Amino acid sequence: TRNGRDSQAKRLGVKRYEGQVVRAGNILVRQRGTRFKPGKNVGMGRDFTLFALVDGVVEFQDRGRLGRYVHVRPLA
Amino acid sequence: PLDVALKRKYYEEVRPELIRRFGYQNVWEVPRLEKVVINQGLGEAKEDARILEKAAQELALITGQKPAVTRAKKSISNFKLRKGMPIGLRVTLRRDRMWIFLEKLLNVALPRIRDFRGLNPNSFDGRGNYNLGLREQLIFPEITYDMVDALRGMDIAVVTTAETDEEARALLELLGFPFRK
Amino acid sequence: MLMPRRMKYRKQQRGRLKGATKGGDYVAFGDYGLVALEPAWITAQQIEAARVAMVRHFRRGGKIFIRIFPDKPYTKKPLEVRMGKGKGNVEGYVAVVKPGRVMFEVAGVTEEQAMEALRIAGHKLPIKTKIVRRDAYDEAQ
Amino acid sequence: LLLECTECKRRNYATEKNKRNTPNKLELRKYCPWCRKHTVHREVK
Amino acid sequence: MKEGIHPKLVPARIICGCGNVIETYSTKPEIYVEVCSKCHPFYTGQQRFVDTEGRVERFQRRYGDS
Amino acid sequence: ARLTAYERRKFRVRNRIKRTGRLRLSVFRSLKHIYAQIIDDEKGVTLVSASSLALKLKGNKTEVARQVGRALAEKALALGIKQVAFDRGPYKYHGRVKALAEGAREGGLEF
RNA sequence: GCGCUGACUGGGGCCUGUAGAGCACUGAUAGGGCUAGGGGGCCCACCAGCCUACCAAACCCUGUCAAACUCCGAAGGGUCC
RNA sequence: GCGGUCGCCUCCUAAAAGGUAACGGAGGCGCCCAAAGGUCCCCUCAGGCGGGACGGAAAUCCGCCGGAGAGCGCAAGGGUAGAAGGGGGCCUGACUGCGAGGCCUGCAAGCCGAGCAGGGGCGAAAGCCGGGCCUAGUGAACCGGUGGUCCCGUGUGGAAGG
RNA sequence: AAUCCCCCGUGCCCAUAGCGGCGUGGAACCACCCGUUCCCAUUCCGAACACGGAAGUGAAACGCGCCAGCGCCGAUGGUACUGGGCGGGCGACCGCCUGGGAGAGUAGGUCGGUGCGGGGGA
RNA sequence: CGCGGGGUGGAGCAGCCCGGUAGCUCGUCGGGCUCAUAACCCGAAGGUCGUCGGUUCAAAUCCGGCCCCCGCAACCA
RNA sequence: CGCGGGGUGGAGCAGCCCGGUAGCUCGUCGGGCUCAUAACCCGAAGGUCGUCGGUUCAAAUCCGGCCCCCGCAACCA
Ligand SMILES: [Mg+2]
Ligand SMILES: [Mg+2]
Ligand SMILES: [Mg+2]
Ligand SMILES: [Mg+2]
Ligand SMILES: [Mg+2]
Ligand SMILES: [Mg+2]
Ligand SMILES: [Mg+2]
Ligand SMILES: [Mg+2]
Ligand SMILES: [Mg+2]
Ligand SMILES: [Mg+2]
Ligand SMILES: [Mg+2]
Ligand SMILES: [Mg+2]
Ligand SMILES: [Mg+2]
Ligand SMILES: [Mg+2]
Ligand SMILES: [Mg+2]
Ligand SMILES: [Mg+2]
Ligand SMILES: [Mg+2]
Ligand SMILES: [Mg+2]
Ligand SMILES: [Mg+2]
Ligand SMILES: [Mg+2]
Ligand SMILES: [Mg+2]
Ligand SMILES: [Mg+2]
Ligand SMILES: [Mg+2]
Ligand SMILES: [Mg+2]
Ligand SMILES: [Mg+2]
Ligand SMILES: [Mg+2]
Ligand SMILES: [Mg+2]
Ligand SMILES: [Mg+2]
Ligand SMILES: [Mg+2]
Ligand SMILES: [Mg+2]
Ligand SMILES: [Mg+2]
Ligand SMILES: [Mg+2]
Ligand SMILES: [Mg+2]
Ligand SMILES: [Mg+2]
Ligand SMILES: [Mg+2]
Ligand SMILES: [Mg+2]
Ligand SMILES: [Mg+2]
């Protein structure tokens, strides 16, 4: 057989769901492209990884044509 | 210089005879000239830029504008050509400087074409613009025959505000364009 | 016999046959049809034997339709071997047929003729079948 | 081509990497030392 | 236009089978063109000089009377 | 032909601005006049207005701009507003757009 | 040692792309239509050139298939309160 | 046994979180780029039709139509023109000293990262910059080489060697 | 300020706001326009960008209307599938109960809605 | 269906690594020397690279499938 | 990485010493002997003499930096 290979599962996906309490640092989404875009108080690292910029809670936003967004609405 | 015989002839001759012929309600609706683009397809200069600058030298002499040097969009083996390399020369002349150029094209150049019984009455691209191809750069008055090293023509693209070329035809006609009927 | 040229992938899983005919499904070209009562893999060589049986019993005119197509690659080891080390090998193609599907279907022939042909044609198939005419219902489009 | 470019006194050796035969010159560029701050930095060894 | 890198472009003269073309406006004022066919010489002002159509007609008349 | 160098360049420069979080000093300039608007996004609300067509002034539109520039400061700085970003939209930071910005002095700024 | 936080359950938010279906993409695909060019069969050998009883692109209908196709998309499942 | 395989990335298998096996179905990595890096400013494709000397299916040009089917150094996927793509100007943050908090996770590793300080780059500024659209381009420890630097220097100053 | 009409900004919803046809608007705004001295410009071009202006035009653009040919949205029924619970067939598969319940298609719907701020009106 | 090497003018061989142009001997054709043929001398013609697809700007060349050729293997049982 | 040599024209290759001919063969062309081609004879082609900088009036020479091919010799966690 010429096959037999594969790579390590990269455990990608959302790490904090809407209405979850996070903290400045907490990475909120692990993804390949820009499947989710950084919203309010949400940074995104060189591997497109979204994280809380401040403490607070997590909320999602589907801006249709404009894509989907993860916001960290404060409370801190 | 904002005089020019043809620029004059357009307003005080062509423009009126066009209105009573098509019946334009507005002032702008009547076809204006704009933009005359001259483009030398010069593969002749694949691996030698030395020959590409002599052409530009020539093109600016007849137009009054230094042309821009187009470059190959993609690599295309068969006839050399990779993604780079200067593969053409092009200048876009507009109002005024276009007028003085278009005037000598009618009153000197075309007249100096070996043969010539008129320009092609089908080169209108449908949406009212006209294109014509010349076969040598000696038909222009500025050229001395003793500055040439080899013959290279060019493409001329004249663009009009006229929505149809049925009208675009009249404009060019009345301007003094020698059509083969 | 009858295989689909140019394929993105040769050798494909096998999946199940729990379906019930995606559709289909209601006759749409001829005057009469052969409908599948049971699910099965119909082999290109089974289709070709069903087609021929008809064009043959039709003097030569005739006007089949088939409507099912062998696009699924059927593999099979070289026998006398053991499991492991690659997969099947591809020894033909099949068409997936769940109940409801209309296979074949003929037109431009008498009834006592078309119905006799479809019966013959049906004996060449590994499943149970049914002959139909085509009424309003069929005009589902 | 593994590369280790340095400063211009007390050495330093904050190593980088130039792959080829071009850049093939002195292969130098402005960088910052752990000591004072921001100096020339040249390439060697 | 950008400064330098340019031809001057200046009101000019011209010559032909005609007389004069004041219009011009081009580098190298005063030019002698072989034949400006705009003045009226050549094709336009349909001269049709050295007229033709001998062909049939020619062998026709040296034939009707030979 | 969907979207244009205009509409594009407009978003491009304006999208960046809206990330930094500050209040937006949006500048719309027309052939005759030049207007200025301090907007707060997320509240979708304008705070301080300052036009030239609203101050009925004229005479050299590069000099008018600066006036409506200083005009925006005064009105605004009196509302607490000090620090802001400054749009600029489709217009290169130049001429009368640059002028109005240079006029926005006497009020928070950094520009 | 801490001690009501547990499995499970109710309500609420968010995550998903399977079952099913679909053909909008990637490909596969039956019939018919209309037409690039060729099989041709040929007039020429100067334009040419007529016809399609084999193709066959696209395009249009009527029909369908797909683990590595998806315009769609349940039930469920995950997680936080 | 013979043959094949052995680490890393992509896709499916995988049953809509994560994960998941087989000598299950298919591909790819062991590099590369001083610009293919940072920043500021501009620019928008592929195709299709019509038009235009040498130009031909396709070189360069003009017109309309063209939301992305183009491009993004190479596999695949995800992503993307409201740029991550194309062009230019300056520049080297392919920084030093750190690091809240998390992703992942048996260990050891691998990954993302705000912010502070030093000294800088581009920018009017807001600001961005601790390499590259991203996910492969990799090797614990031991033993040594090389350049520094304080540190130890077998009675003491050195030196040897660390 | 109230209410309202038109226009310029700027948001949000993210095609029911879109394509295309037709019709409208220049007092005011806007655009085109008029020039290229000056700032600044286009690998060539004052096309773009940019400045200084305003005679002219709503032709282009944009704004506002109308039209369902296309695009987009789209029920209600009814099915497919399926939590959970039960049966049946050698199987390949099928049926029942109880909860959830699409996709396609049909009827239809739509050529926008609205926030704040300006300028002009009533 | 295990492993390895191949397939290129009419014959037999190169060229394939590493891309971009196909070379050698013989033969074939035309002309010469000879009374004549061969030898000998002067000229010329002739290959899409088994095949379908893929990669790249470009494929005899790199990659994959299929059809043939040669060689090796098929052991404990 | 350590030690030693040098690339001269289309090829190897002498001139490398006490700084001074930038040579010889085969291949191809011209010309004659040959019934012939080769042999064989006459003449002729091509060197900034690996890189740059130096010490002398120069230099292929000597030094030095430099670059790979070849040459030599160890080591490899
Ligand atoms: Mg596996
Ligand atoms: Mg995986
Ligand atoms: Mg959703
Ligand atoms: Mg159906
Ligand atoms: Mg370092
Ligand atoms: Mg409790
Ligand atoms: Mg639980
Ligand atoms: Mg619950
Ligand atoms: Mg979906
Ligand atoms: Mg399915
Ligand atoms: Mg399809
Ligand atoms: Mg297709
Ligand atoms: Mg068909
Ligand atoms: Mg599926
Ligand atoms: Mg997929
Ligand atoms: Mg839907
Ligand atoms: Mg739950
Ligand atoms: Mg829940
Ligand atoms: Mg073995
Ligand atoms: Mg999963
Ligand atoms: Mg095009
Ligand atoms: Mg064309
Ligand atoms: Mg054409
Ligand atoms: Mg793409
Ligand atoms: Mg790719
Ligand atoms: Mg992709
Ligand atoms: Mg993609
Ligand atoms: Mg760039
Ligand atoms: Mg740059
Ligand atoms: Mg940590
Ligand atoms: Mg790593
Ligand atoms: Mg990378
Ligand atoms: Mg050990
Ligand atoms: Mg040591
Ligand atoms: Mg050590
Ligand atoms: Mg001491
Ligand atoms: Mg002692």
Ligand SMILES: [Mg+2]
């Ligand atoms: Mg001591």
Ligand SMILES: [Mg+2]
């Ligand atoms: Mg040591």
Ligand SMILES: [Mg+2]
């Ligand atoms: Mg030491």
Ligand SMILES: [Mg+2]
């Ligand atoms: Mg508005």
Ligand SMILES: [Mg+2]
């Ligand atoms: Mg939609």
Ligand SMILES: [Mg+2]
């Ligand atoms: Mg419309």
Ligand SMILES: [Mg+2]
């Ligand atoms: Mg009107």
Ligand SMILES: [Mg+2]
């Ligand atoms: Mg309108």
Ligand SMILES: [Mg+2]
């Ligand atoms: Mg008026």
Ligand SMILES: [Mg+2]
């Ligand atoms: Mg007026």
Ligand SMILES: [Mg+2]
């Ligand atoms: Mg209008």
Ligand SMILES: [Mg+2]
């Ligand atoms: Mg308007």
Ligand SMILES: [Mg+2]
């Ligand atoms: Mg529907």
Ligand SMILES: [Mg+2]
């Ligand atoms: Mg329903």
Ligand SMILES: [Mg+2]
């Ligand atoms: Mg529905």
Ligand SMILES: [Mg+2]
């Ligand atoms: Mg309506």
